[PDB]
Design an enzyme around this catalytic site. Structure first.
Site, PDB file in Angstrom:
ATOM      1  N   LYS A  45      44.014  16.798 -30.820  1.00 18.21           N
ATOM      2  CA  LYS A  45      44.606  16.183 -29.631  1.00 18.21           C
ATOM      3  C   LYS A  45      44.272  14.699 -29.533  1.00 18.21           C
ATOM      4  O   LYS A  45      45.046  13.934 -28.966  1.00 18.21           O
ATOM      5  CB  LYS A  45      44.165  16.913 -28.361  1.00 18.21           C
ATOM      6  CG  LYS A  45      44.804  18.285 -28.190  1.00 18.21           C
ATOM      7  CD  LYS A  45      44.135  19.087 -27.076  1.00 18.21           C
ATOM      8  CE  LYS A  45      44.911  20.299 -26.624  1.00 18.21           C
ATOM      9  NZ  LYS A  45      45.057  21.256 -27.729  1.00 18.21           N
ATOM     10  N   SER A  65      38.405  24.787 -30.553  1.00 12.71           N
ATOM     11  CA  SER A  65      38.061  26.170 -30.848  1.00 12.71           C
ATOM     12  C   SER A  65      39.289  26.900 -31.345  1.00 12.71           C
ATOM     13  O   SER A  65      40.414  26.562 -30.994  1.00 12.71           O
ATOM     14  CB  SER A  65      37.513  26.866 -29.613  1.00 12.71           C
ATOM     15  OG  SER A  65      38.512  26.919 -28.630  1.00 12.71           O
ATOM     16  N   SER A  77      41.843  20.188 -22.553  1.00  9.54           N
ATOM     17  CA  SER A  77      42.310  20.872 -23.757  1.00  9.54           C
ATOM     18  C   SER A  77      43.564  21.714 -23.485  1.00  9.54           C
ATOM     19  O   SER A  77      43.730  22.806 -24.032  1.00  9.54           O
ATOM     20  CB  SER A  77      41.190  21.704 -24.381  1.00  9.54           C
ATOM     21  OG  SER A  77      41.314  21.679 -25.793  1.00  9.54           O
ATOM     22  N   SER A  80      41.687  21.959 -31.422  1.00 11.26           N
ATOM     23  CA  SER A  80      42.036  20.968 -30.406  1.00 11.26           C
ATOM     24  C   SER A  80      41.472  19.572 -30.634  1.00 11.26           C
ATOM     25  O   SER A  80      41.843  18.653 -29.916  1.00 11.26           O
ATOM     26  CB  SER A  80      41.683  21.435 -28.992  1.00 11.26           C
ATOM     27  OG  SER A  80      42.660  22.324 -28.475  1.00 11.26           O
ATOM     28  N   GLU A 127      50.917  23.961 -31.059  1.00 13.88           N
ATOM     29  CA  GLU A 127      50.113  24.966 -30.379  1.00 13.88           C
ATOM     30  C   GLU A 127      50.963  26.191 -30.082  1.00 13.88           C
ATOM     31  O   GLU A 127      52.113  26.044 -29.689  1.00 13.88           O
ATOM     32  CB  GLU A 127      49.583  24.415 -29.050  1.00 13.88           C
ATOM     33  CG  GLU A 127      48.605  23.251 -29.173  1.00 13.88           C
ATOM     34  CD  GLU A 127      47.237  23.694 -29.630  1.00 13.88           C
ATOM     35  OE1 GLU A 127      46.356  22.823 -29.784  1.00 13.88           O
ATOM     36  OE2 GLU A 127      47.029  24.906 -29.815  1.00 13.88           O
TER      37      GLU A 127
HETATM   38  O1  LIG Z   1      37.984  27.267 -25.015  1.00 11.78           O
HETATM   39  C1  LIG Z   1      39.027  27.534 -25.655  1.00 11.78           C
HETATM   40  C2  LIG Z   1      39.081  28.746 -26.505  1.00 11.78           C
HETATM   41  C3  LIG Z   1      38.103  29.840 -26.830  1.00 11.78           C
HETATM   42  C4  LIG Z   1      38.689  30.835 -27.771  1.00 11.78           C
HETATM   43  S1  LIG Z   1      40.370  30.435 -28.245  1.00 11.78           S
HETATM   44  C5  LIG Z   1      40.358  28.974 -27.229  1.00 11.78           C
HETATM   45  N1  LIG Z   1      41.388  28.109 -27.088  1.00 11.78           N
HETATM   46  C6  LIG Z   1      41.248  27.035 -26.289  1.00 11.78           C
HETATM   47  N2  LIG Z   1      40.124  26.753 -25.595  1.00 11.78           N
HETATM   48  C7  LIG Z   1      40.108  25.543 -24.775  1.00 11.78           C
HETATM   49  C8  LIG Z   1      39.425  24.488 -25.608  1.00 11.78           C
HETATM   50  N3  LIG Z   1      38.396  23.716 -25.197  1.00 11.78           N
HETATM   51  N4  LIG Z   1      38.033  22.866 -26.251  1.00 11.78           N
HETATM   52  N5  LIG Z   1      38.881  23.155 -27.322  1.00 11.78           N
HETATM   53  N6  LIG Z   1      39.738  24.176 -26.890  1.00 11.78           N
HETATM   54  C9  LIG Z   1      38.035  32.071 -28.326  1.00 11.78           C
HETATM   55  C10 LIG Z   1      36.728  32.270 -27.550  1.00 11.78           C
HETATM   56  C11 LIG Z   1      35.959  30.970 -27.262  1.00 11.78           C
HETATM   57  C12 LIG Z   1      36.691  30.003 -26.322  1.00 11.78           C
END
Ligand SMILES: O=c1c2c3c(sc2ncn1Cc1nnn[nH]1)CCCC3
Length: 262
Positions: A47, A211, A104, A44, A140
């Protein structure tokens, strides 16, 4: 190899994964790099480039940020905290940019990508602002597969730090647009456990986390330290196995090492 680089190497060794760091200290334009020219999956953090590209478009279309975009049930992907509230309605490009950056929201990102014509439109903007490294290849959620060795949807710490500097502190965007980007980053909701957890509390910052699979845990930040010129800091981290756990603490530790090295 510097003392800071050796500390980052020790952190990396204990982490089990692969760590990439780039600092630009705008006090003197000096840099600290750790695996600064290795590729990492952006997740992310990409973005920021998409939101900035739409901001750039808005420089020649003053009403663009107010343009409505339809959100349909089929548009929802795997993480849609804002977009799910607007299904069967619309969100403006400003609302989508804020949702992408500050929450996000992955559906919001897809709408930004579509506004730019597809992933290659985001890459084209990167090239237009002098970033020859960034590549966005997918939408995405598949841009988060984060497979080791896969160049798709990657950049290097060095390139991303330079780009973030140009976007937030430099002249890549018009003044109004730069200010809007900084305002959005400073209002991020997702960042308190990442870079900013490793910084003195008196400092202020804006950031965008990422993440993905392979326990990929990322953050890119613009930082205003107390009594110092701003810093730009990128911390990327990825792990050998697909189902690895998130490690925001590693990013906090990297940031703390950087801060104590100033
Ligand atoms: O937190 C997640 C996660 C997580 C994942 S996938 C994911 N996708 C988006 N997001 C939202 C995000 N916030 N900042 N970047 N992306 C696996 C476990 C840990 C948390």
């Amino acid at each position: 190899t510097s003392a800071v680089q050796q500390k980052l190497a020790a952190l990396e060794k204990s982490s089990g994964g692969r760590l990439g760091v780039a600092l630009i200290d705008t006090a003197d334009n000096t840099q600290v790099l750790y695996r600064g020219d290795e590729r990492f999956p952006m997740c992310s953090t990409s973005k920021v480039m998409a939101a900035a590209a739409v901001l750039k478009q808005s420089e020649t279309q003053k009403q663009l940020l107010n343009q409505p975009v339809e959100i349909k049930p089929a548009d929802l992907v795997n993480y849609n905290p804002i977009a799910e509230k607007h299904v069967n309605g619309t969100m403006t490009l400003a609302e989508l940019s804020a949702a992408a950056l500050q929450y996000s929201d992955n559906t919001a990102m897809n709408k930004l990508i579509a506004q730019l014509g597809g992933p290659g439109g985001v890459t084209a903007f990167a090239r237009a602002i002098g970033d020859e490294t960034f590549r966005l290849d997918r939408t995405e959620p598949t841009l988060n597969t984060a497979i080791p060795g896969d160049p798709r949807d990657t950049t290097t710490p060095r390139a991303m730090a330079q780009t973030l500097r140009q976007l937030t502190l430099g002249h890549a965007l018009g003044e109004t647009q730069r200010a809007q980007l900084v305002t959005w980053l400073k209002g991020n909701t997702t960042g308190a456990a990442s870079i900013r957890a490793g910084l003195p509390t008196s400092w202020t910052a804006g950031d965008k986390t990422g993440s993905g699979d392979y326990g990929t845990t990322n953050d890119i930040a613009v930082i205003w330290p107390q009594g110092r010129a701003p810093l730009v800091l990128v911390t990327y981290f990825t792990q050998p196995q697909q189902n690895a756990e998130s490690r925001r603490d590693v990013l906090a530790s990297a940031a703390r090492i950087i801060a104590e090295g100033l």
